[PDB]
Amino acid sequence: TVTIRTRKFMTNRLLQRKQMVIDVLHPGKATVPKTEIREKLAKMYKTTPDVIFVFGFRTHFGGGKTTGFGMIYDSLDYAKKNEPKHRLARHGLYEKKKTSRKQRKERKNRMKKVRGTAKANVGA
Amino acid sequence: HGSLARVGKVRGQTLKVAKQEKKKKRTGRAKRRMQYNRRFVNVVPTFGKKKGPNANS
Amino acid sequence: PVARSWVCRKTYVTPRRPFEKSRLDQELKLIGEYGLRNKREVWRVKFTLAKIRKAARELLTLDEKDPRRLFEGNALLRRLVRIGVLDEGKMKLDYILGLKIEDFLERRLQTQVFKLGLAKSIHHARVLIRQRHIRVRKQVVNIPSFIVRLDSQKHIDFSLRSPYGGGRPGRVKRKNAKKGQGGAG
Amino acid sequence: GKCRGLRTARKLRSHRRDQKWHDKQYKKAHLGTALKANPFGGASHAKGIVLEKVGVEAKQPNSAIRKCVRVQLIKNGKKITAFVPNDGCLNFIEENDEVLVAGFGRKGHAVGDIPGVRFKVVKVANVSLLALYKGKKERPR
RNA sequence: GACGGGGAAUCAGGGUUCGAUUCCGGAGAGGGAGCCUGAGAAACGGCUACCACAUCCAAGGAAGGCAGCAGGCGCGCAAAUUACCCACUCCCGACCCGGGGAGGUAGUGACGAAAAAUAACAAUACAGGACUCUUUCGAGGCCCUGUAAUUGGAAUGAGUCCACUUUAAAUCCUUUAACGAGGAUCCAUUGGAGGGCAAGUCUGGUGCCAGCAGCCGCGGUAAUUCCAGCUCCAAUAGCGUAUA
Numbered sequence: 001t002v003t004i005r006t007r008k009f010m011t012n013r014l015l016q017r018k019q020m021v022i023d024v025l026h027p028g029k030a031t032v033p034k035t036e037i038r039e040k041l042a043k044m045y046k047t048t049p050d051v052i053f054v055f056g057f058r059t060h061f062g063g064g065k066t067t068g069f070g071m072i073y074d075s076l077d078y079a080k081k082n083e084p085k086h087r088l089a090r091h092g093l094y095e096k097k098k099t100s101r102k103q104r105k106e107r108k109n110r111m112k113k114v115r116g117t118a119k120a121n122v123g124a
Numbered sequence: 125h126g127s128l129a130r131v132g133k134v135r136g137q138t139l140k141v142a143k144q145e146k147k148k149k150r151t152g153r154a155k156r157r158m159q160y161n162r163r164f165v166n167v168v169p170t171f172g173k174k175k176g177p178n179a180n181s
Numbered sequence: 182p183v184a185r186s187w188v189c190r191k192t193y194v195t196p197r198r199p200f201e202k203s204r205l206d207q208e209l210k211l212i213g214e215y216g217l218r219n220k221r222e223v224w225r226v227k228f229t230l231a232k233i234r235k236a237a238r239e240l241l242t243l244d245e246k247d248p249r250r251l252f253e254g255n256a257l258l259r260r261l262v263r264i265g266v267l268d269e270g271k272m273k274l275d276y277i278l279g280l281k282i283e284d285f286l287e288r289r290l291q292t293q294v295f296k297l298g299l300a301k302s303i304h305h306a307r308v309l310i311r312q313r314h315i316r317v318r319k320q321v322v323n324i325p326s327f328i329v330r331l332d333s334q335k336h337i338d339f340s341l342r343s344p345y346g347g348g349r350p351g352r353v354k355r356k357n358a359k360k361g362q363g364g365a366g
Numbered sequence: 367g368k369c370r371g372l373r374t375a376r377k378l379r380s381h382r383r384d385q386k387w388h389d390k391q392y393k394k395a396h397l398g399t400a401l402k403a404n405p406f407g408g409a410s411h412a413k414g415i416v417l418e419k420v421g422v423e424a425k426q427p428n429s430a431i432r433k434c435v436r437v438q439l440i441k442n443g444k445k446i447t448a449f450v451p452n453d454g455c456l457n458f459i460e461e462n463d464e465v466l467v468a469g470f471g472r473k474g475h476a477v478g479d480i481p482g483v484r485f486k487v488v489k490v491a492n493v494s495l496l497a498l499y500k501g502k503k504e505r506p507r
Numbered sequence: 508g509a510c511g512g513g514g515a516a517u518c519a520g521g522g523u524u525c526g527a528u529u530c531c532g533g534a535g536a537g538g539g540a541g542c543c544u545g546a547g548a549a550a551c552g553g554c555u556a557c558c559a560c561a562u563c564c565a566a567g568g569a570a571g572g573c574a575g576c577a578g579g580c581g582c583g584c585a586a587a588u589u590a591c592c593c594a595c596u597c598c599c600g601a602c603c604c605g606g607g608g609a610g611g612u613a614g615u616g617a618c619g620a621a622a623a624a625u626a627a628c629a630a631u632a633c634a635g636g637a638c639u640c641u642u643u644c645g646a647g648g649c650c651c652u653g654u655a656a657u658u659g660g661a662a663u664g665a666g667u668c669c670a671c672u673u674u675a676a677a678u679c680c681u682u683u684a685a686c687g688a689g690g691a692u693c694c695a696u697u698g699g700a701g702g703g704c705a706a707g708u709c710u711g712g713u714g715c716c717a718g719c720a721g722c723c724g725c726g727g728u729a730a731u732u733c734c735a736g737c738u739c740c741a742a743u744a745g746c747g748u749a750u751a
Contacts, residue, residue, distance in 0.1 A: 028342070030683035031671045057672060059682045062321040063342070066672085066682085082603095086594065086675050096675090101592070127716095129421065129431055132454020134717040138734050141711085147656075148694050151743080152625055153218045157304060158654090160213025166653055168635075178700080178707040178739040182529045182609085184596075189620040200705040200741070218623085219743065301628060308627050312663040324622070344662080351662050352687080395751090401508080408508075410750040411584040427724075429715040441583065453718055453734075466584075469749040471721050478720065488749080 002026045004040050016078040017071045022054065024066040031059050031066060047072055051079045053087050193224040194231075215286050216295075216303035222326070226285050233257070237277040264288060265331045290317075290327035297337060316340040404474065405444040411468050411488070414439035414446070416459060422447075425479040432480050435459060435487065437467055448485035452499050458490055465490050 007021040022041075026032050034054050042049035057068035073079040080088070088094040111123045126133075150158065196204065211223050236257065243250050254274055261267040261277065266284040286292070291306050294315060300306035309315065310325045317327070318336045329337075339346025344354070369377050386392055394400040406412050414437040421431045433456045438445045448467045450456050459465065466489035471477045474484055487495060497503040 026682085028683095029671095031681085033671060055673095058680095059672065060320075061323075061681060062316070063682050068672095084594070084675090089675085129716065131433060131456045132717075134713050134734055135453050136717090136734095137713070139712055141736055143736080147690065148625095148692085150625080151695055153216065153304065153307065154626065155743095156209070156212050156218070157216070160209055161653065163209065164213065166634085176706070176739085178709090180707050180709050180738080184611085185529085187529090191620070198704090202705070205705070205741090221743090305627050308662080311624080311626095314663090326622080353661060357660075398508085406584095406750080408751080409584060413584075424715090428726080430718070430726085431716095432718095468584090471749080473750075478722095486749085 016074045027064040291325040314343045
């Protein structure tokens with residue numbers, strides 16, 4: 001019984017995506033996770049359930065309403081091109097090197113201590 | 125006796141009694157409700173000088 | 182250089198005399214009749230009434246046919262008639278000064294629930310509001326100091342997720358029902 | 367006022383400034399002598415080491431003596447005289463111990479029947495006198 | 508005990524005080540002095556000499572400036588993490604791609620500001636109250652008002668706790684299932700009770716002693732002011748004290 005109504009629909013030919021504001025009605029239950037929102041927007045808009053990228057869902061005080069943002073892309077190449085990396089990591093197609101800032105800064109300073117070919121050697 | 129100006133004499137020789145275990149006191153909105161009730165709707169029309177809340181003459 | 186606001190103000194003004202008699206008498210009468218918690222609330226209502234009266238006085242010292250006077254005076258009058266403390270027959274600049282603290286405290290949500298006819302007493306009304314039982318236009322209110330408008334008075338009813346307006350029962354009903362099932366089984 | 371001319375403002379300002387300097391509270395509040403003679407140095411509280419204990423006597427209306435200690439501060443080196451307020455709180459203080467002194471009520475003025483004392487002891491051995499007097503905290507042994 | 512201004516507190520009307528402090532301008536990187544490069548520096552996370560301070564050393568020499576972000580010593584009445592990230596705001600560079608303690612995030616946090624729990628209802632208990640009467644007794648007590656550890660059923664919240672949401676990844680808020688209150692021990696404190704100034708000619712103890720007291724003054728062997736219990740009063744998650 002979880003319905004979805006759209007709001008502020010506007011499409012971009014220059015971003016190859018359609019931005020809209022999602023209003024989710026889920027009375028009597030908890031906040032619904034984003035993946036059923038992705039399949040329901042895939043069902044209503046007749047699109048594959050992998051180019052829809054939703055975020056920013058805040059539940060109103062009282063329970064029953066949830067307002068959030070969501071985009072519908074044309075294809076996977078456009079979804080890979082102009083997006084932030086963390087949404088792609090949430091959907092599981094991007095991963096970053098597991099190093100902290102302190103190790104990188106210390107390695108940069110230690111590499112700055114020497115010159116030449118040994119700059120790559122001291123950085124391990 | 126000892127000395128005249130002994131430091132902490134009276135508090136040192138004061139009798140020691142214990143507190144009495146009592147019911148807890150309401151605080152917050154119900155305290156003001158009880159005060160309003162006892163001061164304004166449980167009163168009787170009297171004359172002369174109004175009696176104090178702690179009058180034990 | 183951080184991106185904050187740092188904008189805040191006090192909503193009440195303490196009286197000059199700390200230990201008077203008659204002032205404490207009408208403050209206690211107001212607290213007991215409207216079911217308030219402390220003197221800070223009635224001092225807050227007195228402060229906002231004093232601010233409204235001060236604005237009305239400084240606009241009443243002014244002359245007629247001044248466009249900014251007509252404009253923000255009509256703004257003040259439409260606010261005072263939409264909040265529920267003024268009538269259409271008294272839409273004048275001097276009639277703001279004839280207002281009382283009873284008119285501002287009568288539009289409080291607590292006394293509106295008490296006089297609407299779904300609460301036993303005003304303290305029961307505050308307990309009923311504080312325990313999430315009512316709603317105002319498809320939106321529950323958890324606080325008693327919700328000053329309602331004239332166009333939103335006829336929409337106050339029990340909330341859907343409450344045992345009083347039809348819904349799931351509370352915890353002592355379910356606990357006693359489970360105890361009865363255990364004793365009968 | 368006396369000068370009522372339209373071009374009389376310098377004279378009024380100079381006369382008001384002279385009569386403002388010719389005052390009492392503005393006189394103590396604007397020279398450096400009244401703040402330099404203050405042992406606190408424009409401070410609310412101060413620390414120092416207790417040297418000895420003195421029993422200072424009351425005035426002529428009443429017959430009692432006042433239990434008092436003498437404090438040598440560290441921020442300036444001055445020696446002051448500070449009253450231990452409550453009943454029996456002198457026994458919590460010994461020699462060569464640090465205390466936190468404060469004002470005694472009338473901004474550098476002898477209060478009550480105690481002559482020549484303008485300070486009081488608030489804390490002793492980094493714990494307050496009220497907590498030791500009410501039996502909440504204990505002196506660290 | 509002076510960085511200036513936009514401003515802040517108090518405020519009938521005029522006035523008084525503050526402004527080190529996130530915005531604008533100016534000055535400095537121990538203090539003076541001199542200079543290279545560059546469009547723009549008398550630059551100090553650039554250089555060169557002085558003094559003060561100061562690190563390493565095989566004793567010939569070499570290397571410095573946290574009034575940047577954390578942290579330490581000293582000082583004083585007085586002031587926080589030797590955390591995470593470039594996602595948001597922008598900045599620099601050959602440049603959609605790199606970097607940024609600028610900044611954002613959380614921790615510490617009773618400077619302060621806003622909202623707001625610590626209970627409500629029902630029948631008996633028992634003090635009255637309005638209506639013709641019973642003149643003044645009882646009653647109709649159908650209609651109340653109140654509180655006594657008499658009793659029983661409904662309630663929601665702190666806290667524990669699947670999940671979901673938020674987020675660079677979390678945490679906090681909100682949503683939500685399983686638990687979760689009768690003396691609902693899941694127990695609200697801070698200052699007072701002679702006057703100013705709201706509130707005991709109460710009880711017991713010391714007896715111009717101890718002490719209280721911002722000011723008058725209170726204590727002398729019957730204390731309304733001391734020291735303890737009861738009761739009461741002012742504000743309430745807040746209250747008292749010292750200094751401008």
